[PDB]
Paper text:
Here, we report a novel cellulase belonging to GH5 family, named as CelE1, retrieved from a sugarcane soil metagenomic library, which is a promising biocatalyst in biofuels production. CelE1 is 1284 bp long and encodes a polypeptide of 428 amino acid residues containing a putative N-terminal signal peptide followed by a glycoside hydrolase domain belonging to family 5 (GH5). Cellulases or endoglucanases (EC 3.2.1.4) catalyze the cleavage of random internal β-1,4-glycosidic bonds in cellulosic chains and can be found coupled to the cellulosome or generally secreted as independent enzymes. A new plant cell wall-degrading enzyme with ability to breakdown complex cellulose-based substrates was isolated and characterized from sugarcane [name]. This enzyme was shown to be an endo-acting glucanase with high catalytic activity at a broad temperature range and under alkaline conditions that usually cause enzyme inactivation of classical acidic cellulases.
Numbering used by the authors: 1 to 296
C-alpha cells in the first residue's frame, strides 16, 4: 500500500524515485514520563488528516527509568502506534530510543526480530536501532553493534529501511561516511539537529557525508536548543529545511508532546484524542506544522 523505501548511493528512494517525507516523533514512551498518553490511534489519525504528516516515530525508551528494560508495556505502546500508522497509510519508525544500545544487544536483537517478524511485510515500517550514541567510537562501538542487529533483521525482512545512529548525539555522519556499513540493502544513517544549538558547521558535516555516498535520515530534529529547552530559532530552522529539501532528507520533529519545555509541539493539556486548534500549538508546534503541511 505505501511505496517501498530503498537506498541507492546517497539517496533514500520511495517506489524507486527521489523524494522525502516529513512527520513527527512522539516523546519517550517511558511509563511516568508523560508522552505515553499520545501513543494512540486518534493522535496518529489527526497528524495525518490535519498536519498532512507522512510519518510518526515511536521513541521506545530502553534503559532509562520506566523504559522497556524494566517495563514490558513500552512494547505495547509501540505496536499501538505501528498498527495505527499502517491503518492510516503513514510510514512509522520503530526507534530503540537509547544512548547505550550496544550494552543491550541481545534485547535489541530479540525486539527487532519480533518486529521484523510481525511487520516486515508492510512497506510502512522503518527500523531505527540506536537513537543517539554519545561521544563513542563509530568503528569500535556503534558499527559492530549496528552490524550485528542488521544481520538479524535482514534474515527476516530483506528490504525495509534500517537507520543507524552516529556518534555525538547522531551528529557525526561524516565519520560514518569514512567507514560505511557495506553489503546490506537499504541502510541509512541518522542525523539529529536542534536549530537553537546547531547550524552551518553541522550542515557542512552532513554535506561531506552525502558527498562520500551515504544516505541520511533526520529521525529527530527540533527548532529549539539541544536539551529540548529554549526559544524557537525560526531562521536557523528555515536554513535546515532548505538543506533537507535540497538533499531529499526525510525528517521527524521532536516532540509531539505537551510537557512545559520549548521542544513540545503542544500546550500542556492538549487532548490525547487530537483535534487541536491553533492555540493548542506552541511556537515550536506551529512552526513544525507549517513545515510538515508544506512538504513536497
Amino acid at each position: 500500500m505505501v511505496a517501498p523505501i530503498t537506498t541507492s548511493g546517497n539517496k533514500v528512494l520511495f517506489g524507486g524515485q527521489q523524494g522525502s517525507i516529513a512527520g513527527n516523533s512522539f516523546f519517550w514512551s517511558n511509563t511516568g514520563w508523560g508522552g505515553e498518553k499520545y501513543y494512540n490511534a486518534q493522535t496518529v489519525a489527526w497528524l495525518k488528516s490535519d498536519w498532512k504528516s507522512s510519518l510518526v516515530r515511536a521513541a521506545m525508551g530502553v534503559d532509562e527509568s520506566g523504559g522497556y528494560i524494566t517495563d514490558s508495556y513500552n512494547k505495547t505502546r509501540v505496536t499501538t502506534v505501528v498498527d495505527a500508522a499502517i491503518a492510516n497509510n503513514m510510514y512509522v519508525i520503530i526507534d530503540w530510543h537509547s544512548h547505550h544500545a550496544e550494552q543491550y544487544q541481545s534485547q535489541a536483537i530479540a525486539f527487532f526480530k519480533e518486529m521484523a517478524t510481525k511487520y516486515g511485510n508492510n512497506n510502512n515500517v522503518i527500523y531505527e536501532i540506536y537513537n543517539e550514541p554519545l561521544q563513542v567510537s563509530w568503528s569500535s562501538v556503534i558499527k559492530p553493534y549496528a552490524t550485528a542487529v542488521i544481520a538479524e533483521i535482514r534474515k527476516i525482512d530483506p528490504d525495509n529501511l534500517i537507520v543507524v545512529g552516529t556518534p555525538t548525539w547522531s551528529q557525526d555522519v561524516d565519520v560514518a561516511a569514512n567507514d560505511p556499513i557495506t553489503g546490506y540493502a537499504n541502510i541509512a544513517y541518522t542525523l539529529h539537529f536542534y536549530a537553537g544549538t546547531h547550524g552551518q558547521s553541522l550542515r557542512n558535516k552532513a554535506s561531506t557525508a552525502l558527498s562520500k555516498g551515504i544516505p541520511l535520515f533526520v529521525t529527530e530534529w527540533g527548532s529549539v536548543n539541544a536539551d529540548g529547552g529554549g526559544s524557537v530559532a525560526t531562521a536557523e530552522t528555515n536554513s535546515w529545511v532548505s538543506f533537507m529539501k535540497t538533499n531529499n532528507i526525510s525528517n521527524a520533529n521532536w516532540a509531539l508532546n505537551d510537557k512545559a519545555e520549548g521542544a513540545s509541539a503542544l500546550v500542556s493539556g492538549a487532548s490525547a484524542n487530537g483535534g487541536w486548534t491553533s492555540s493548542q500549538l506552541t511556537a515550536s508546534g506551529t512552526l513544525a506544522k507549517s513545515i510538515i503541511s508544506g512538504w513536497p
